[PDB]
Ligand binder design. Structure first.
Ligand SMILES: C/C1=C\[C@H](C)C[C@H](C)OC(=O)C[C@H](c2ccc(O)cc2)NC(=O)[C@@H](Cc2c(Br)[nH]c3ccccc23)N(C)C(=O)[C@H](C)NC(=O)[C@@H](C)C1
Ligand SMILES: C/C1=C\[C@H](C)C[C@H](C)OC(=O)C[C@H](c2ccc(O)cc2)NC(=O)[C@@H](Cc2c(Br)[nH]c3ccccc23)N(C)C(=O)[C@H](C)NC(=O)[C@@H](C)C1
Ligand SMILES: C/C1=C\[C@H](C)C[C@H](C)OC(=O)C[C@H](c2ccc(O)cc2)NC(=O)[C@@H](Cc2c(Br)[nH]c3ccccc23)N(C)C(=O)[C@H](C)NC(=O)[C@@H](C)C1
Ligand SMILES: Nc1ncnc2c1ncn2[C@@H]1O[C@H](COP(=O)(O)OP(=O)(O)O)[C@@H](O)[C@H]1O
Ligand SMILES: Nc1ncnc2c1ncn2[C@@H]1O[C@H](COP(=O)(O)OP(=O)(O)O)[C@@H](O)[C@H]1O
Ligand SMILES: [Mg+2]
Ligand SMILES: [Mg+2]
Lengths: 766, 370, 370, 187
């Protein structure tokens, strides 16, 4: 159910902007206006609700609003509230349109009642514009079959269609075969919010065409190989038994005569630090556990496997999860590898690499106080059979791997000298070895899934799709959740880019100066989190290279150097263990425990060549490219630096294309249809930045409507102008606007639409 | 973009581009001029041979080092070495990169002011920080708490640092280094029967000092056991083809570091200036300073300097504390490697001395950012 | 909900959440500032080290206590200690809880007014009572009738209470405490041959004073038997590794509490200010005040202070009454524990000073609820 | 400390005889400034603060700031890295450790002694520092006599040339009785 961190967090999300409207005229008279309040014993008794629509009682004060609880139907007892009173759009059926920008009031409870009413009427979609909003029904609504594909695909008019996946994907393919520009659909949300389901809706809509209806094997190949990316790629967090800790990104080439014929999967931003340590209620990547429980006695006897609590890379107290089988799922992993046609010998080598990683993580180190140094990194005695077994299962010469772990060698003017490593730095070598072997294993099998389905000439233009997360709003955040919020600031900057671009060019097309539209600057947060030389990540590179670096020195170094901007702020409680960033969605707190355990990644090319010299051509295909450096990789081998390179390339792949956006929200935590819970849904509104996307929606001339829809919608305001049809429709509409008492600053006269601000929209609807 | 880390050593300029693990250029601080006029027409004149070419032609050159005890005594020679270092050896222009020079502690102010005056007037460097060799060796040591005893060819520092804070009332330098050990080695080889007088002969004495000298554990015991010449005598082959037979001069050659009265100096040994620098610190941090005696420099490349240094300090220190010297391999380059790690930071890039700031304050700004 | 009990001790801030038996935070009232500039780039600057971190880095810090004799001499340092206490050590916000500060009797009014001005203006505390350390120690004593002699690092109170009624004409304070005994211990160690001058050296003298000093039964007899040094000499190991050999300075180190003319003060001893506070009470309650001499504070943690105090008072008192000192274990925390028991009552919650009441009367309301 | 700042100027004195040459420089050239920051800022423009000195080698020493930062470590000991207090703050701190009646008679007689009070303006700097620290209603009168190097020994004459003081010696037979501990009974 909903928890007190969710009730408290969602309670902190609740803001107040617009004042509550109670009056008809200048006299102290009410109209029976329905409001919203957070003070109700229903909310104090039902945690599924945070807002109660009431009705303002007659003869109440201006400073204190007497209300009767009507939605939900509590008792008819008039109780008093602080004008904690939010405006409502009571006169509007939510099934009449699907764009929250058409709501007069865009506070939080009108959006919760609009999406609440539409979800409870089994209308799970809502066009934010240019967003779309999906809510999981936890069932089939039937509107996803091939007949609805033909209906939302084949009509000549598409703006008379209700909000859907198929409508926005239709806009994307129409923009594909219209103009040769790549479109990219970004499915964002929590990993349990049905992003795979809406993904499969995009896969059947792209699959289905007018002639090439099912003339593809691409959805068969990728969707058959779904539990490989889910096998290696999903880990339990405190939010999901099946969380997606990276981004699947599928570039699909669409026929004009048919559907998908070519495509590729590329994952992006695969978290590596999860392999080494985890949290308490967090699993590792599942393939470790379901490999330790799904294997037979030949695979366990050959690999020397152990119990699921006897691996130090693995969280020993979160191995057992009721929602995940971890036994028969592994058979879907084996057959799902056979769906991309990998031999059982090669699959046996794959899980030999996996068993070698889990075996390698048990190898202990010791400090030898008798060397030339102070301490010396040494491998423990009884872990030597563990180590030789580990390189044997990874098909590596263990003497040369031990050479790369315990001995550094450099040449200085013609002098090969062998330095000895420290214990903690050799732990960074072993951990970096496990993480690099895991990720290049993952991308290797992704290269086999793409080896079936690729365009062999490359991607000239394509049709991209990005499975991606949302803002981890919650409290105990770390380096991984910092990377999450950085990626969401990049995607947010892309959102303000494309919304300012469409609205700026649409001001241009109607003869309106775009200087009255304002760019909401994401540049401060991107500078504080990413700018090379003055960021948080640059100083984390410093504390990886500052030799006596701790985590208190990191938070304090950022506290003393990033004080020029308010977007960094040191937290009050435990001011060296917690730092608060002013993101675009607001203050997010970060715990500082074990930063340097997570960032320190030293993948030295001297080891990379030893792994490229493996007798196994599989292992030779694991590390491809990645030339030797022979100097410091300390500027680029960190998880911060690799994260900025992969994030740089991914933002190069999305900024080069034209995007279209999908917001996936899941209503409850019980996986039940038509169960509504305003806290977790509100956290998903703030966590996909849907509220701030509505702020950008209500930025500028928000409420525009075409002249025919203004003269049809507001026909009854001035019936003498709209029914004339001799005076021009522009003059009709501005006669309606001047009739209702609107200054010319609030409306601009288009050639196809009437341009209204939210102030002009609220004064117009009185 | 990347900085340019130059170690102006007293006997080896060690320079290279930042972000590396070893210097690209390890070449000695030698300016040689030909004592003989050239007679073959069709050759290069080249009145100043600088660097390693001056050492490969050592038989026909007056070889001079511009660095006497960490201090430039001839600025034209040092400008030739910097010019060769930047243009002819690193092959990178000074305008393209910031340079990171380094400096002995208690170096006179004229070396900083004249040095940065050269690097902004003669070379057009955009930005430059000069630094202490010892604190850079403690960057490369992997610690932030310890005592660095440096020993190059001009200096022998003992800089203690406790948790990122320098102790400028406890920096004790010492003018015992590789050059005084080469000169003393020449005197005891005058005692054995070999006469080395010129500069190239001093370099041959330096190769003997590298390949044959080692620090004894107890010097009197090695003298008394070396009265009966059994294995203490060794051989060496020259660039003439002869044979050098050394006796006591393997273990009395570096013993002048620990007993400077062999050199006739009224100074203290490396163990007594190190321990004397421990006693000039405050009495709480000494446990964290007896624990990290970080060696550095090429004059700590002998055999058993960790063993002799631990038994000498352990004799001097209170016996309840363990003395743990840190003698890493590549301790010759522990300055330069630290110069990489310092220049490859993001906070440190707020600490350069820009071109316009020198154009405002002159050289005195270097005494405000050091 | 639960109050927040903070003991602003002169040498140990002892703070913790109410309803406990021991403080969560026992850390000294030290603000240290670095006397040396930092030189390692990639560190925390942190110009004011507050609390226990300032004591773990004591060798590189000027360590200054803001409490001279129960009186704040520097309000910025005390505000840093409260800020560290609330946010960095207890990890509880001041807005979430009421705070219960405490105060040595006959403290000047500027400490109360400036103190509550800080706790309502700087920190946003909803409600706060300040209290007397001695009456809180008598809450934790389990009695309502007795004499508390407090002795911290600034003060030495003698507050008598007979059956819940204070005797404000008999509160006698004394400026003899742990800090004057550390200073006097430094002077007699100057007599033995050890020189402790700095602040970290004063803290080492405090550790010697804790581990080695004990109150003699009869001081002249221990001097005459300690003329023949048999077992009175002890050893101690420093953070340098040396050996301290103490002789008379085990029993003349705390003897200045009982004979203050060693410190050159024209005051009276703890036994004569205690007994002198008995004689300033009325003549009926003294039987109930000779019976409960409640010790408190960390300067009553010596050996035989109950025995010496009973024989001194028993010498001074009429011989027909028994003198029964109460020396409980955890008498260091008897203030704070009482601060729990006082703040965990239901009647006491009618006695806070709310935020709006300070917003009405200003700080003068604290002189109406004390 | 004068050797360290002469390492800063460009002179290296390391041995013991070199320390004695540094002592002759410290006697002939060091003087206490009236206000140290003002003398630093006026000595940024080197006009008359630089002086010369001739060694027993025949060279020339040119001193700059090291005439007035050489004895300034007496008043600001943090130049020497010591956590102690200056002469004015240990003197005034010794006034505050006395009782509060005699201080008028102790602010009035600050008697200098010893050879490290032979600088220039130590009376002036000491009076302005104590006068800054003391309450302003009392006059601070330092007594800086000539021959203050010998004020110990001269007093040792005047003490030993008394008739009452001859009742206070420690005789040979009394040491032969008590041993050295009798010196802790007559001091
Ligand atoms: C490896 C070298 C030499 C040889 C091949 C090495 C072999 C080993 O020497 C000998 O055995 C010969 C002998 C010698 C004579 C008696 C004896 O019980 C041992 C050796 N020594 C000598 O004749 C001295 C004469 C000398 C001049 Br003039 N002033 C000097 C000042 C001090 C000392 C000695 C001298 N001698 C050869 C030289 O200096 C010449 C200039 N040395 C060199 O530049 C190089 C080539 C060093
Ligand atoms: C535990 C300590 C020291 C040592 C390890 C402890 C051992 C025990 O001391 C000795 O045995 C040595 C000796 C000493 C000499 C003769 C003697 O019959 C006994 C002891 N005492 C001295 O040299 C004095 C010199 C001194 C300075 Br200047 N002004 C002073 C003012 C008053 C007294 C004395 C002095 N001395 C060592 C110090 O002050 C230093 C600064 N002390 C310390 O900060 C810490 C480390 C204390
Ligand atoms: C009065 C004295 C010297 C001279 C006659 C005085 C004149 C004035 O000095 C110069 O002008 C020459 C120059 C110098 C160079 C550059 C400059 O901008 C100013 C002066 N200084 C030097 O070469 C240093 C070299 C040095 C050694 Br190695 N380690 C050192 C550690 C720290 C500093 C410097 C050094 N130098 C001469 C010495 O130490 C010798 C050993 N000094 C002495 O024992 C006595 C005789 C002091
Ligand atoms: N293997 C060795 N054994 C003994 N001495 C050596 C060895 N290698 C170098 N040295 C001495 O150490 C010196 C190194 O000087 P250097 O490392 O350049 O210090 P600096 O950089 O301060 O000049 C050389 O002059 C040489 O004499
Ligand atoms: N075991 C001990 N023996 C002797 N003195 C002690 C001992 N423990 C603490 N002290 C002294 O008591 C002092 C602690 O007093 P404290 O309880 O903090 O009083 P306050 O709380 O008023 O500051 C310390 O300064 C210390 O010198
Ligand atoms: Mg060097
Ligand atoms: Mg106390």
């Amino acid at each position: 159910a909903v928890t007190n961190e969710e009730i408290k967090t969602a309670s902190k999300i609740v803001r107040r902007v617009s004042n509550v409207e109670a009056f008809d005229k200048s006299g102290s008279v009410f109209k029976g206006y329905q409001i919203w309040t957070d003070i109700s014993p229903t909310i104090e008794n039902d945690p599924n609700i945070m807002f109660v629509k009431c009705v303002v009682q007659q003869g109440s004060k201006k400073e204190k609003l007497t209300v009767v609880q009507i939605d939900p139907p509590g008792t008819g007892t008039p109780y008093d509230i602080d004008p904690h009173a939010w405006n409502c759009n009571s006169q509007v059926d939510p099934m009449s349109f699907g764009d929250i920008g058409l709501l007069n009031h865009t506070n939080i409870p009108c959006v919760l009642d609009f999406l609440k009413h539409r979800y409870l009427k089994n209308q799970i979609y809502t066009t934010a514009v240019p967003l779309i909003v999906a809510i999981n029904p936890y069932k089939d609504l039937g509107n996803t079959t091939n007949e609805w594909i033909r209906r939302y695909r084949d009509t000549a008019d598409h703006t008379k269609l209700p909000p859907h996946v198929f409508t926005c994907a239709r806009e994307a393919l129409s923009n594909l075969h219209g103009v040769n520009k790549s479109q990219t659909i970004i499915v964002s949300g929590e990993s349990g919010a049905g992003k795979t389901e809406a993904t499969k809706q995009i896969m059947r809509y792209f699959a289905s065409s007018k002639s090439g209806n099912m003339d593809l094997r691409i959805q068969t190949a990728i969707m058959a190989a779904n539990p490989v990316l889910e096998a290696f790629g999903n880990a339990k967090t405190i939010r999901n038994n099946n969380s997606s800790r990276f981004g699947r990104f599928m570039q699909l080439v669409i026929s004009h005569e048919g559907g998908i014929r070519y495509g590729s999967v590329v994952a992006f931003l695969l978290e590596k630090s999860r392999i080494i340590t985890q949290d308490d209620n967090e699993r590792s990547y599942h393939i470790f556990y379901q490999f330790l429980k799904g294997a037979n006695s030949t695979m366990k006897s050959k690999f020397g496997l152990k119990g699921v609590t006897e691996y130090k890379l693995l969280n020993p107290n979160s191995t057992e999860v009721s929602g995940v089988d971890d036994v028969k799922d592994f058979e879907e992993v084996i057959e799902s590898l056979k769906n991309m046609e990998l031999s059982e010998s090669d699959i046996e080598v794959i899980f030999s690499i996996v068993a070698g990683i889990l075996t390698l993580g048990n190898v202990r180190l010791i400090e030898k106080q008798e060397a030339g140094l102070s301490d010396a990194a040494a491998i423990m005695d009884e872990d030597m059979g563990v180590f030789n077994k580990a390189c044997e299962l990874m098909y590596l010469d263990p003497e040369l791997i031990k050479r790369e772990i315990l001995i550094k060698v450099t040449v200085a003017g013609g002098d090969k000298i062998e330095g000895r490593w420290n214990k903690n730095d050799a732990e960074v070598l072993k951990s970096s070895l496990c993480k690099a072997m895991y990720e290049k294993l993952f991308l290797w099998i992704i290269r086999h899934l793409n080896s079936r389905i690729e365009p062999e000439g490359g991607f000239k233009t394509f049709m991209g799709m990005l499975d991606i997360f949302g803002f981890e709003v919650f409290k105990n955040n770390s380096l991984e959740q910092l990377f999450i919020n950085i990626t969401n600031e990049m995607l947010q900057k892309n959102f303000v880019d494309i919304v300012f671009e469409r609205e700026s060019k649409l001001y241009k097309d109607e003869g309106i100066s775009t200087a009255e539209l304002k760019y909401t600057s994401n540049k401060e947060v991107i500078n504080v989190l990413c700018e090379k030389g003055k960021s948080v990540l640059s100083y984390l590179e410093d504390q990886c290279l500052a030799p006596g670096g701790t985590d208190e020195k990191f938070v304090s170094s950022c506290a003393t150097n990033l004080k020029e901007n308010n977007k960094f702020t040191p937290a009050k409680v435990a001011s060296n263990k917690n730092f608060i960033i002013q993101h675009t969605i607001g203050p997010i707190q970060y715990c500082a425990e074990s930063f340097l355990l997570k960032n320190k990644d030293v993948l030295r090319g001297d080891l990379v060549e030893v792994i490229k010299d493996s007798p196994n051509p599989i292992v030779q295909q694991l590390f491809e490219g990645q030339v030797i450096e022979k100097g410091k990789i300390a500027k680029g081998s960190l998880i911060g630096s690799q994260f900025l390179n992969q994030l740089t390339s991914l933002m190069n792949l999305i900024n080069s294309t034209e995007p279209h956006f999908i917001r996936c929200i899941k209503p409850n935590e019980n996986k039940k249809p038509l169960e509504w819970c305003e806290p977790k849904i509100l956290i998903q509104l703030h966590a996909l930045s849907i509220l701030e996307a509505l702020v950008l929606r209500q930025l500028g001339y928000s409420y525009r409507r075409t002249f025919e829809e203004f003269l049809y919608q507001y026909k009854f305001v001035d019936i003498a102008a709209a029914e004339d049809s001799s005076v021009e429709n522009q003059n009709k509409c501005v006669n309606i606007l001047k009739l209702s008492g609107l200054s010319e600053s609030m409306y601009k006269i288009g050639k196809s639409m009437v341009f209204l601000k939210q102030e002009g929209a609220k004064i117009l609807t009185k | 973009v990347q900085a340019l880390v130059v170690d102006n050593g007293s006997g080896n300029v060690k320079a290279g581009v930042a972000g590396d693990d070893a210097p690209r250029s390890v070449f000695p601080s030698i300016v040689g001029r030909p004592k003989n006029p050239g007679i073959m027409v069709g050759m290069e004149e080249k009145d100043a041979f600088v660097g390693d070419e001056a050492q490969t032609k050592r038989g026909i050159l007056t070889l001079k080092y511009p660095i006497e005890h960490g201090i430039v005594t001839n600025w034209d020679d040092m400008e030739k070495i910097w010019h060769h270092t930047f243009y002819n050896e690193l092959r990178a222009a000074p305008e393209e990169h910031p340079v990171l020079l380094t400096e002995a502690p208690l170096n006179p102010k004229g070396n900083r002011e004249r040095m940065t005056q050269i690097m902004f007037e003669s070379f057009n460097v955009p930005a430059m920080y000069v630094a202490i060799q010892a604190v850079l060796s403690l960057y490369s040591s992997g610690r932030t708490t310890g005592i660095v005893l440096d020993s190059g060819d001009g200096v022998s520092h003992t800089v203690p640092i406790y948790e990122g804070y320098a102790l400028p009332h406890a920096i004790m330098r010492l003018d015992l280094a590789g050059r005084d050990l080469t000169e003393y080695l020449m005197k005891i080889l005058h005692e054995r029967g070999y006469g080395f007088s010129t500069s190239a002969e001093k370099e041959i004495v330096r190769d003997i000092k590298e390949k044959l000298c080692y620090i004894a554990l107890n010097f009197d015991e090695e003298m008394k056991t070396s009265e009966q010449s059994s294995d203490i005598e060794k051989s060496y082959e020259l660039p003439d083809g002869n044979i050098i037979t050394v006796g006591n001069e393997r273990f009395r050659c570096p013993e002048a570091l620990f007993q400077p009265s062999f050199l006739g100096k009224e100074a203290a040994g490396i163990h007594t200036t190190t321990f004397n620098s421990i006693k000039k610190c405050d009495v709480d941090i000494r446990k964290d300073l007896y624990g990290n005696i970080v060696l550095s420099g090429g004059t700590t490349m002998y055999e058993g300097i960790g063993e002799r240094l631990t038994r000498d300090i352990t004799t001097l220190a209170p016996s309840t504390m363990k003395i743990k010297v840190v003698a890493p391999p590549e301790r010759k380059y522990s300055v330069w490697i630290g110069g990489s790690i310092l220049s490859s930071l993001s906070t440190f890039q707020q600490m350069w001395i820009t071109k316009e700031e020198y154009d405002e304050s002159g050289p005195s700004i270097v005494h405000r950012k050091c």
